[PDB]
Structure formats: C-alpha cells, structure tokens
C-alpha cells in the first residue's frame, strides 16, 4: 500500500491521473519524482521549469554543480539528484526532443531508467514541449517500465484522450 490517490489503473504496474506533478509531488512526497530533463539540466520550461520553480531554483543550483563536475547527460540517460522539498530524490530523465530532431527510438531507453526504482511519480517522457505523441509515450511507458509508475498528466483534455484511446 502507498499514498497515491485517485489514479486510474491501466496495467499491473502503471497508473494515471489528471494532476499537476508539482502539486502531486508536494502532497505525496514520493521517494522518486521524475523530471523531464534535457542533457544540460537546464530547467527552463515544461515540467522541468515547473519543478525547478517549486524548489525556489535549488534544483537548478544543484544541477549546475552536477554538470560542472560530470558534463552533460546522454539522450535516453538519467541521473539521480535531490528531490528538494518535492520528493526524496529527483530522477532527471532525458527523453528525445522531437523539436531537436532526436531519434524517438531513444524513448524506450529513457523509460528503462525507471526500472531502477521500485515506485515513481512521473510525467510522460518526451510529451509536451518535447514534441512527441503522448499516446505513443504512454504506450512505450507501459511496454517498458516494470516497476510501479504513477503518471501525472497536467492537461485534462489530453488525459481523457489518453484514457479513452488506451489499449
Ligand atoms: C508544465 C507542467 C507542470 N506540471 C506538469 N505536470 C505534468 C505535465 C505532463 O507530464 N503531461 C504529460 C501533460 N499535461 N498536460 N499536457 N501535458 C506537465 C506539467
């Protein structure tokens, strides 16, 4: 039993809700919140901009130190950093950015990072300003992640389309 509430069950291990991941994180305090990161950990907009703003920019400060030490992530890769006031940990995961021409096949590799964590609160990777089809992202999620994933979808209209079209 865990503290996630109001989710629709899609599969054995994947759950979905129309929610603001920032507000969902502040209420649940999950062990892991997933950020929709880029390779530079520049959290300017989309989910990343929202998560960083909710940490009063502490996420960005920590991220800049990480990059100065380690260099950029790979597309499809991840790193674990602090969850600040939102979660114990933040798993920064880089999905392909279609608006940068990145290979959408890398979306599966991105979701594989979730399997290193037993339970996660997450957005749909590569959705939103990353330019992929969220229906596709949900399908890859279900077909790749084996650990327990609680997906937050900010847009109600998209949420109902995702539920109604789910196979
Ligand atoms: C910008 C932002 C703040 N909070 C958020 N929470 C979730 C998502 C999201 O992951 N998806 C799939 C989504 N919702 N509406 N359109 N896309 C995006 C945000």
Swiss-Prot record:
Compartments, as annotated in UniProt: Host endoplasmic reticulum membrane
Regulation: Inhibited in vitro by GRL-0617.
Membrane topology: Multi-pass membrane protein
Superkingdom per UniProt: Viruses
Record's catalysed reaction(s): Thiol-dependent hydrolysis of ester, thioester, amide, peptide and isopeptide bonds formed by the C-terminal Gly of ubiquitin (a 76-residue protein attached to proteins as an intracellular targeting signal)
Boundaries of every Macro domain copy: 1-167
Function: Responsible for the cleavages located at the N-terminus of the replicase polyprotein. Participates together with nsp4 in the assembly of virally-induced cytoplasmic double-membrane vesicles necessary for viral replication. Antagonizes innate immune induction of type I interferon by blocking the phosphorylation, dimerization and subsequent nuclear translocation of host IRF3. Also prevents host NF-kappa-B signaling. In addition, PL-PRO possesses a deubiquitinating/deISGylating activity and processes both 'Lys-48'- and 'Lys-63'-linked polyubiquitin chains from cellular substrates.
Quaternary structure, from the entry: May form homohexamers. Interacts with N protein.
Protein name: Papain-like protease nsp3
This protein's encoding gene: rep
Region of the whole protein represented: 1025 to 1191 of 7096
